[PDB]
Amino acid sequence: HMFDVVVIGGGISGLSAAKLLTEYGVSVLVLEARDRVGGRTYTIRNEHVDYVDVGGAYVGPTQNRILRLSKELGIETYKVNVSERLVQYVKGKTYPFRGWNPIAYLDYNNLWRTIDNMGKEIPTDAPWEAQHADKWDKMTMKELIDKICWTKTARRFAYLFVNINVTSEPHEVSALWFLWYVKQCGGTTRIFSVTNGGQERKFVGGSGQVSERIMDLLGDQVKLNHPVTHVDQSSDNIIIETLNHEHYECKYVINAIPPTLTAKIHFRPELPAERNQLIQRLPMGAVIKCMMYYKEAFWKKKDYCGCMIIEDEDAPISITLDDTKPDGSLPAIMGFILARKADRLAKLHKEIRKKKICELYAKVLGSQEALHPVHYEEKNWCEEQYSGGCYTAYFPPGIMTQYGRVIRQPVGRIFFAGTETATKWSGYMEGAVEAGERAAREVLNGLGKVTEKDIWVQEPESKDVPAVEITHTFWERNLPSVSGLLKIIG
Numbered sequence: 001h002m003f004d005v006v007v008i009g010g011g012i013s014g015l016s017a018a019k020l021l022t023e024y025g026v027s028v029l030v031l032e033a034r035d036r037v038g039g040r041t042y043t044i045r046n047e048h049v050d051y052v053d054v055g056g057a058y059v060g061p062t063q064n065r066i067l068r069l070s071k072e073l074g075i076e077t078y079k080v081n082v083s084e085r086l087v088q089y090v091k092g093k094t095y096p097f098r099g100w101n102p103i104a105y106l107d108y109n110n111l112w113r114t115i116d117n118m119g120k121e122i123p124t125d126a127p128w129e130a131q132h133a134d135k136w137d138k139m140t141m142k143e144l145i146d147k148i149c150w151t152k153t154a155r156r157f158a159y160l161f162v163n164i165n166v167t168s169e170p171h172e173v174s175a176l177w178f179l180w181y182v183k184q185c186g187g188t189t190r191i192f193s194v195t196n197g198g199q200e201r202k203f204v205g206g207s208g209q210v211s212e213r214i215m216d217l218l219g220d221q222v223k224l225n226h227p228v229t230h231v232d233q234s235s236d237n238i239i240i241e242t243l244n245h246e247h248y249e250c251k252y253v254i255n256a257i258p259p260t261l262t263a264k265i266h267f268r269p270e271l272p273a274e275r276n277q278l279i280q281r282l283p284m285g286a287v288i289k290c291m292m293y294y295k296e297a298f299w300k301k302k303d304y305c306g307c308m309i310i311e312d313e314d315a316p317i318s319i320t321l322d323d324t325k326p327d328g329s330l331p332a333i334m335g336f337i338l339a340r341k342a343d344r345l346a347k348l349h350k351e352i353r354k355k356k357i358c359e360l361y362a363k364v365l366g367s368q369e370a371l372h373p374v375h376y377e378e379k380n381w382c383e384e385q386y387s388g389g390c391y392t393a394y395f396p397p398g399i400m401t402q403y404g405r406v407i408r409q410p411v412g413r414i415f416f417a418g419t420e421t422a423t424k425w426s427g428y429m430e431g432a433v434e435a436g437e438r439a440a441r442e443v444l445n446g447l448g449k450v451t452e453k454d455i456w457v458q459e460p461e462s463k464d465v466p467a468v469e470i471t472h473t474f475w476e477r478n479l480p481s482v483s484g485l486l487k488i489i490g
């Protein structure tokens, strides 16, 4: 009933921290509100699908921490199929293996250039200290996207891309924020890897194993069905309180739930206003994740690796990967219904999306078989109580530089982790682990077992999944823009 350090929440994060404090031999205790551990990663396990993930799914080069961690728990990885052509759906026509207009294409590549080149000036660790932090944060992704682009086409492309990447609509998010986000993932090419093929990987057996495996290492030290609702940090013995009125006592809390639900807690004494805001004012993105299963892998039969970037207003699925199991079994297709459409289509009955979707995929892969699915799993994170959304927190304009600077500041004995508070790959599981270990080492450092300078450990690049530093073609760097080519006439 009494402990060294509590961790509130049992996602990849609060768990990464629990294991690490354990490593050192500190009494840990992890209260998670759900029946399960795993949070935004969640592995529905049923005889129709064997395993299938419904949240955190894809790992990739430079995401060493999670790769490291998962490997150690005894979890293997595998490559996501992209051998065959990539479908492009627009104007109601299909294009295989695709990113045709020049001045568009200028606008295209110059956009994505200006995004990276623009990002160079952003301090991953304190993005609100970029040079133009005040001007970009006041701006919106759309405004900027608009400024950068002259073609619709590419301006459009920009859009789902914001959508695809932070499950949110452009007009909603900071300019600065997006920029810093695509940055701290290592910038366009990392974030949206694979143009005529590349590297996404899934954990074999579903990534919910990462969390589960740890819950073993801890065993009874993880209490489930335990929402935390008060954290009276007053006297030298912290008193945490839960929903069911089960108290606990400790010397270090660690908040590991995300910032909205953090916001939901009663801390006595109050978190200081500066942050108390920042917590209220971050929202979570919008996504439905959608498994279509098939008997036959048909889309392969047709010469599509089973992946389509679909850019048409009514289509429900925005983006698609293949989700066939590693060993050829259970052919499938994994889509994303997201952002604004995710709010639009979540009001619907399961069996009505399932149709809508199928009839899209139908007219895209051009194969009637699409009309005849065999199973359909979906998960709607809009409608998660203990997550608010997927993938992450996101930043509405001006918030970043107004309160942003807190995000992760330790208050009292209540340190803060969770993929929000990450620095590298923040928003993804990789970032989850980053935060947990960090928070842990803080508590740890406060106990003495770790140094100050010791609290931010670098991350040896997995010898297993080795990231390759990018490459930018001549013309990539040296073609004009529309903005430009005019001053060339002009």
Ligand SMILES: *[C]C1=C([C])[C]=[C@@]23C(=[C]1)N([C][C]([O])[C]([O])[C]([O])[C]OP([O])(=O)OP([O])(=O)O[C][C]1O[C](N4[C]=NC5=C4N=[C]N=C5[N])[C]([O])[C]1[O])C1=NC(=O)[N]C(=O)[C@@]14=N2[C@]43#C[C]N([C])[C][C][C]OC1=[C][C]=C(Cl)[C]=C1Cl
Pocket: 008, 009, 010, 011, 012, 013, 014, 031, 032, 033, 034, 037, 038, 039, 040, 041, 054, 055, 056, 057, 058, 059, 164, 165, 191, 192, 193, 194, 200, 226, 227, 228, 229, 256, 257, 258, 261, 287, 289, 307, 319, 320, 321, 336, 381, 386, 387, 389, 390, 391, 392, 417, 418, 419, 420, 427, 428, 429, 430, 432
């Ligand atoms: C959902 C999702 C999705 C759908 C997707 C995705 C995701 C998700 N992600 C994200 C992740 O997951 C995150 O990051 C994490 O996981 C988070 O974690 P954490 O930190 O730990 O947090 P959480 O989990 O939530 O936990 C927390 C906890 O706590 C608790 N609570 C609450 N409240 C409370 C509590 N306790 C006590 N008390 C109280 N009061 C709860 O229970 C919980 O549990 C991800 N990630 C990664 O890494 N990966 C992936 O994949 C993922 N996914 C994403 C996505 C992405 N995307 C889509 C983009 C990229 C890729 O894409 C692509 C590419 C290519 C192509 Cl072709 C296509 C596509 Cl699409």
